[PDB]
């Protein structure tokens, strides 16, 4: 029954914000410390912040990378845990995992969400499209899709010469 | 200085009921202020959410079975499989939690030795295979999903640029 749920992710221009939400349910909100873990490609798993209960006067801890820029919050009566999220840049790319700490200083995150998925641009086609004719502008645009469905087909088709070995061993039993 | 996680090796090649090794190498002393050392061992399995097998070096999480062992002590820290089965393959993360800022290792991908020939999938169960085939979808959707959100950040450029002229 426990069960942590993130939302609120989603496309960021370099320089935006943004606030995620994480409901709880199954357990007991108010009683556990709630974290903010997120899971890049380059930098791979990284803590991000952590609230502690209202006992502790609600206290925070944050990553350097993310002080005073990010402010992570909690509300027990929805048993919810937030973060807002200001001046992202395209180092702050990732999932966003909302994590719950087992307690009783024995172990931490015991229970992760499913993740959601902020994606901040970067922001360097901004600085080389600007000299570009607009009628160059207006084929770059109509020729992304084509180019988007090339890339999509090479992992589709990665995909098959990864199943056919496997998908042929069942059928040889 | 923040403590840093050293994950070795960074893919480790298996056979199914081979043994298995990963070690982290904390670049200070973890132990925390209360005398604990709370070394974490994860496992991300493809498409989902990484979950806590070992807590405080060596204890077991509940549910863990018991071919999982983690020991360890100073800054060199292991995990062992002691025969590994399909369930285990995945990403496994190393996790110091006694110095703020807590961080995790680099990560090791145990992976299914592939050779030469794809013979070795017919010494599988047919249930490992079709685990292995449902773990594969959403590892597609998750690389398909990467290349949505890439042109989309490729898009909004191109239409500000049309716009500011």
């Known amino acids: 029954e426990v069960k942590l749920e993130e939302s609120g992710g989603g496309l960021v221009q370099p320089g935006g914000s943004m606030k995620l939400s994480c409901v709880a349910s199954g357990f007991t909100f108010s009683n556990y410390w709630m974290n903010w873990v997120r899971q890049s490609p380059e930098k791979g798993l990284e803590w991000v912040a952590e609230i502690r209960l209202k006992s502790n006067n609600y206290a925070t801890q944050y990553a350097e990378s993310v002080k005073w820029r990010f402010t992570i919050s909690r509300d027990d009566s929805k048993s919810s845990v937030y973060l807002q999220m200001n001046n992202l840049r395209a180092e702050d790319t990732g999932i966003y995992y909302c994590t719950r700490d087992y307690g009783n200083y024995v172990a931490y995150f015991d229970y992760w969400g499913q993740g959601t998925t902020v994606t901040v641009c970067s922001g360097s086609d901004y600085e080389f499209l600007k000299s570009w004719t607009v009628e160059d502008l207006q084929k770059r645009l109509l020729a992304l899709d084509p180019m988007m469905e090339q890339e999509i087909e090479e992992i589709r088709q990665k995909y098959q010469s990864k199943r056919q070995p496997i998908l042929d061993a069942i059928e040889a039993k | 200085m923040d403590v840093l996680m050293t994950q070795t090796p960074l893919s480790l090649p298996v056979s199914l009921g081979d043994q298995a090794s990963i070690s982290c190498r904390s670049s200070q002393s973890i132990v925390h202020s209360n005398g604990n050392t709370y070394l974490e061992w994860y496992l991300q399995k493809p498409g989902q959410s990484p979950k806590l097998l070992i807590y405080k070096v060596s204890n077991r999480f509940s549910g863990v079975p018991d071919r999982f062992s983690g020991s360890g002590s100073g800054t060199d820290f292991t995990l062992k499989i002691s025969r590994v089965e399909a369930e285990d393959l995945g990403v496994y993360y190393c996790?110091?939690?006694?110095?703020?800022?807590?961080?995790f290792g680099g990560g090791t991908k145990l992976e299914i030795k592939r050779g030469s020939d794809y013979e070795f999938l017919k010494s599988w169960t047919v249930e490992d295979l079709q685990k292995r085939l449902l773990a594969l979808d959403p590892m597609m959707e998750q690389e398909i999903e990467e290349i949505r959100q890439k042109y989309q950040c490729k898009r909004q450029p191109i239409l500000d640029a049309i716009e500011a002229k």
């Open positions: 996790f110091q939690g006694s110095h703020v800022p807590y961080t």
